[PDB]
Design an enzyme around this catalytic site. Sequence first.
Site, PDB file in Angstrom:
ATOM      1  N   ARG A   1     -46.658 -82.764 -23.703  1.00 20.54           N
ATOM      2  CA  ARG A   1     -47.841 -81.945 -23.440  1.00 20.54           C
ATOM      3  C   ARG A   1     -48.396 -81.297 -24.720  1.00 20.54           C
ATOM      4  NH1 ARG A   1     -48.791 -82.732 -18.173  1.00 20.54           N
ATOM      5  NH2 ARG A   1     -49.222 -84.493 -19.591  1.00 20.54           N
TER       6      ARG A   1
HETATM    7  C1  PLP Z   1     -52.255 -78.567 -21.556  1.00 19.82           C
HETATM    8  C2  PLP Z   1     -51.940 -79.165 -20.190  1.00 19.82           C
HETATM    9  N1  PLP Z   1     -51.429 -78.318 -19.135  1.00 19.82           N
HETATM   10  C3  PLP Z   1     -51.143 -78.852 -17.868  1.00 19.82           C
HETATM   11  C4  PLP Z   1     -51.347 -80.231 -17.618  1.00 19.82           C
HETATM   12  C5  PLP Z   1     -51.044 -80.854 -16.264  1.00 19.82           C
HETATM   13  O1  PLP Z   1     -50.525 -79.943 -15.346  1.00 19.82           O
HETATM   14  P1  PLP Z   1     -48.953 -80.069 -15.162  1.00 19.82           P
HETATM   15  O2  PLP Z   1     -48.237 -80.321 -16.579  1.00 19.82           O
HETATM   16  O3  PLP Z   1     -48.421 -78.728 -14.510  1.00 19.82           O
HETATM   17  O4  PLP Z   1     -48.658 -81.322 -14.192  1.00 19.82           O
HETATM   18  C6  PLP Z   1     -51.834 -81.048 -18.652  1.00 19.82           C
HETATM   19  C7  PLP Z   1     -52.013 -82.567 -18.311  1.00 19.82           C
HETATM   20  O5  PLP Z   1     -52.419 -83.421 -19.162  1.00 19.82           O
HETATM   21  C8  PLP Z   1     -52.140 -80.551 -19.925  1.00 19.82           C
HETATM   22  O6  PLP Z   1     -52.628 -81.371 -20.909  1.00 19.82           O
END
Ligand code: PLP
Lengths: 199, 199
Positions: free
Chosen positions: B178
């Site tokens: 991420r």
């Molecule tokens: C910065 C960020 N937060 C959250 C997410 C997705 O939500 P989660 O990791 O809770 O499935 C992404 C998905 O690409 C992301 O890039």
Amino acid sequence: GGLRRRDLPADPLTLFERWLSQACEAKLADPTAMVVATVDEHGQPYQRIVLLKHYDEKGMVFYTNLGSRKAHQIENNPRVSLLFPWHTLERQVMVIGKAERLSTLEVMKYFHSRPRDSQIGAWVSKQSSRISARGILESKFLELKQKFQQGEVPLPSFWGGFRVSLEQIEFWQGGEHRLHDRFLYQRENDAWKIDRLAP
Amino acid sequence: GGLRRRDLPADPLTLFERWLSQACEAKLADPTAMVVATVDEHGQPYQRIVLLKHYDEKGMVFYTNLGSRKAHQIENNPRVSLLFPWHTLERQVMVIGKAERLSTLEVMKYFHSRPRDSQIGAWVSKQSSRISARGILESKFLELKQKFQQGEVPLPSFWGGFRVSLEQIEFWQGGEHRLHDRFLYQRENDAWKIDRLAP
Ligand SMILES: Cc1ncc(COP(=O)(O)O)c(C=O)c1O
Ligand SMILES: Cc1cc2nc3c(=O)[nH]c(=O)nc-3n(C[C@H](O)[C@H](O)[C@H](O)COP(=O)(O)O)c2cc1C
Ligand SMILES: Cc1cc2nc3c(=O)[nH]c(=O)nc-3n(C[C@H](O)[C@H](O)[C@H](O)COP(=O)(O)O)c2cc1C
Ligand SMILES: Cc1ncc(COP(=O)(O)O)c(C=O)c1O
Ligand SMILES: Cc1ncc(COP(=O)(O)O)c(C=O)c1O
Ligand SMILES: Cc1ncc(COP(=O)(O)O)c(C=O)c1O
């Protein structure tokens, strides 16, 4: 066969659920991905993709870092727009509404409900701020990756989410000769007013 | 292998061209499709997909009906945002700039340069206005389809385009754990300032 008014469900979410279901069924990449547009203090709109994580009559939910640009912008102007870029299926869904913060209970519930490495990553990135090198991210990830190592990753105070209310929902479906089908559901008097819009 | 600052071209369009080329190469649906966000007089952002038709240092171009909602909104607030939803390739490109009207010469050149049925369709739809039935569109299409039948479809006075200036261009590319790569090119003093942004 097309999109005729007589086949539209009274609740736009019924239609949204159907289209979402078919998007997953078709294995489109990131079926829940939507573009969220917010506006800064100068009237400048900004966009970025986020994942829809839940929805019901109260609105559509997504999570993000509370120190991010989208968060700062929402705090100054809660009016947002969401667009599901499903053009591979000749469709678009656009939602207009106000973004409201989710409570701690909701955020905690979702946070601890996801890949451990993602929980740790949430701690690492001061989302949207200028950083001098990618190395800063990787160093911190490793450092925290073993600081939390034996327990459960704590919910960062700077992590949260928003629920976007359903004031308007627009459905678009591709049409021959460039004459597409467009229907705007407009929330009014505890009910939905439907109008076809010229393409 | 990732996106490192040392590999970034001085001109963001070089990187954009490369990514666009690879998007076409990968046969993504509508590689030129971008979400344009505009803002109405109440500070409410609105979004819809349009096709990028041309680009150079002066900006990115798309065509639309001059009586449409996006056109009215741009006339009250020229600040727009463009987002290329290339998440299937783990990428996003966001452009921030001012939308300026294209001249008649440019519009004519492009207009007559496209499917005849599309030229006729442009005449048919009073884009964004509420219409009572799809039938109105089909009737007019047929009616005009033979009114122009023997010559060349005239350019509707209500058809035009906009060029969005390049004030900022942001590139995003998916990253492990991420921790994605984000670079913001910011136009400054006849030059581009590049900063990495935390994901
Ligand atoms: C910065 C960020 N937060 C959250 C997410 C997705 O939500 P989660 O990791 O809770 O499935 C992404 C998905 O690409 C992301 O890039
Ligand atoms: C498919 C996909 C899903 C994403 N989901 C989220 C998300 O749910 N929450 C989030 O904060 N960022 C998400 N991002 C990253 C955002 O697009 C954006 O980079 C980030 O939120 C910072 O935006 P901001 O600087 O405008 O605040 C995602 C990116 C992609 C391509
Ligand atoms: C793949 C795709 C490409 C499109 N390209 C354009 C375009 O170039 N110009 C345009 O006016 N509308 C285009 N549209 C339709 C718009 O999304 C939108 O319905 C229309 O412009 C009216 O928006 P408005 O009511 O905000 O003005 C396209 C839709 C899709 C799904
Ligand atoms: C990962 C992360 N997100 C957000 C923030 C902070 O929000 P703020 O801009 O108030 O510092 C921090 C702040 O130190 C942080 O480490
Ligand atoms: C209303 C409208 N105008 C224009 C376009 C595309 O531009 P052009 O028909 O000139 O290739 C589209 C594409 O879907 C469209 O929906
Ligand atoms: C196809 C089409 N587009 C746009 C317009 C008009 O723009 P306006 O809202 O000023 O009537 C018309 C107006 O009659 C029209 O027929």
